[PDB]
Each structure stands twice: as structure tokens, then as C-alpha cells.
Amino acid sequence: WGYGKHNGPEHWHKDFPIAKGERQSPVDIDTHTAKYDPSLKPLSVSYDQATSLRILNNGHAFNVEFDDSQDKAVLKGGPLDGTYRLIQFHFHWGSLDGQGSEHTVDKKKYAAELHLVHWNTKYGDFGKAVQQPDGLAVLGIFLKVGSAKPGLQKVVDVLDSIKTKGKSADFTNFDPRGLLPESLDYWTYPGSLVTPPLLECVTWIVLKEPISVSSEQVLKFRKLNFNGEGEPEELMVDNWRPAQPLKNRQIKASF
Numbered sequence: 465w466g467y468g469k470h471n472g473p474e475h476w477h478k479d480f481p482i483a484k485g486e487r488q489s490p491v492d493i494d495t496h497t498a499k500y501d502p503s504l505k506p507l508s509v510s511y512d513q514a515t516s517l518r519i520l521n522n523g524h525a526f527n528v529e530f531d532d533s534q535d536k537a538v539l540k541g542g543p544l545d546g547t548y549r550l551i552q553f554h555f556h557w558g559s560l561d562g563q564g565s566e567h568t569v570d571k572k573k574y575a576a577e578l579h580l581v582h583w584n585t586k587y588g589d590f591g592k593a594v595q596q597p598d599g600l601a602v603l604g605i606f607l608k609v610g611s612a613k614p615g616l617q618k619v620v621d622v623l624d625s626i627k628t629k630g631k632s633a634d635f636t637n638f639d640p641r642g643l644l645p646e647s648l649d650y651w652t653y654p655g656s657l658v659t660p661p662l663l664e665c666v667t668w669i670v671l672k673e674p675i676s677v678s679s680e681q682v683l684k685f686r687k688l689n690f691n692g693e694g695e696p697e698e699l700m701v702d703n704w705r706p707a708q709p710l711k712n713r714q715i716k717a718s719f
């Protein structure tokens with residue numbers, strides 16, 4: 465599985481039948497169809513005590529991992545019930561500024577998309593959570609090309625060290641609060657992971673307001689390799705999946 469012509473998203477179903485399930489992600493968010501739900505509570509992002517450990521290239525993206533042995537970085541409120549712990553955050557981008565996001569807004573595609581992954585602590589470990597319908601909460605943030613995101617530079621600068629698959633590097637004292645937009649207005653629907661196993665255990669929280677990054681920032685992302693060290697170089701670009709059918713599900717808005 466990958467994003468190539470032969471192992472791309474159109475092929476995942478072979479291996480992962482759930483690929484053509486009822487609550488697959490990503491999706492196109494029709495803003496005219498989204499339902500304003502007044503019963504929706506404000507998001508509660510507590511990341512002041514966040515502990516980042518490292519960054520690694522897993523061959524499909526680069527993940528910044530956090531210490532989730534305690535309620536240090538959590539997400540609550542909104543459409544959620546109980547506390548969700550931050551375990552990792554990563555991105556999805558394109559070969560061009562014209563594509564890269566997972567989710568689309570009225571068919572519009574962004575440069576990239578940030579996923580902050582949290583797991584329902586009632587289930588004890590990530591592993592068990594991914595086996596429940598209310599197992600995960602993923603915070604989705606759109607990235608547009610414009611002005612630099614100061615808070616993102618610490619990450620861009622470390623990319624050289626994890627160019628190939630299986631590389632990792634210590635990445636302590638990184639504050640995720642620097643990647644958040646000003647407003648926390650969101651869209652929410654019941655979905656799945658956007659990559660295999662594509663388990664349907666995610667509660668998506670898509671922020672309305674995108675953050676901007678400079679052309680130079682996103683460009684460094686495109687210098688990554690899907691391949692392992694000493695193998696033919698395959699640039700890590702377009703690690704996104706085509707939008708899926710909403711199939712009855714309803715997209716709710718907090719605004």
C-alpha cells in the first residue's frame with residue numbers, strides 16, 4: 465500500500481475491504497448542506513503540558529509523537545464525550561499548491577492538511593481505541609500558501625534528518641499550540657482513518673479557518689522520500705486519498 469499508480473488508494477480495498485464501507489473518510493464538506501447544530505459545545509484544547517518526544521518518517525508521512533502516558537495534551541468538549549489524548553500529529557500534502565488536503569470544502573483543495581490524533585482514554589491504549597466507534601478524535605487543519613508559520617519552522621528544519629523511511633530524531637519541547645488557527649469553529653462527522661487499516665473509529669473535527677504557510681515551508685515537505693535509505697528515490701508528495709461518499713451521514717457545524 466502506498467500512493468503510487470500500482471499501490472495507490474484505488475487498490476487499498478483489496479487488502480482493506482473496509483475501504484468501501486459506510487463511514488469512510490475523507491469527504492467533501494458541502495457548506496450549504498452542513499447542519500448548524502446549536503447543541504454543539506465549544507472545543508476544549510489543553511496542550512500547555514504537552515510533551516513531544518520524537519519525529520519519524522514511517523514511509524507514508526512524518527509523525528511527531530507525544531508522551532500519552534498521562535493526560536498532558538488532551539481534547540474534550542465539542543461533539544466528544546470524555547477525554548481524548550494526543551498521541552501524534554502529521555500532515556498530507558501535494559506535489560503542487562493546488563492539491564494535498566484530504567478533506568475539501570465545497571470541492572476546494574488546500575495545499576495540505578494537519579491531523580492531530582487523539583484517543584479516548586476510557587479504552588486504555590491507542591490499540592484498543594482504534595477498535596471502537598468512538599475510539600479516535602482527529603483534529604483536521606487546512607494549510608494554505610501565503611505567509612510563513614513561525615511555529616512550524618522547528619519542524620521544517622528537522623526534516624533533513626529524517627529524509628528516508630525508518631529514520632527518526634529526538635524532537636522534544638515542541639508546542640503544538642503554535643499550529644492552531646485563531647478560531648476553533650468546526651465541522652464534525654463520523655468517519656475513518658484516511659490510511660490503511662482505514663478503521664471506522666474516528667470522530668472528525670475539521671476547523672473552518674486554515675493556517676497559512678510559506679511556499680518555502682511546504683517545499684521542504686516535498687523533499688521527503690517514501691523509500692528507505694539507499695533505494696531509488698521516490699519523493700513523498702500526494703500522500704492523500706480521494707474523497708469518499710458521505711452515504712447518508714450528516715456533517716454538522718458549530719457555527
Ligand SMILES: [Zn+2]
Binds near residue numbers: 556579658
Ligand atoms: Zn492523517
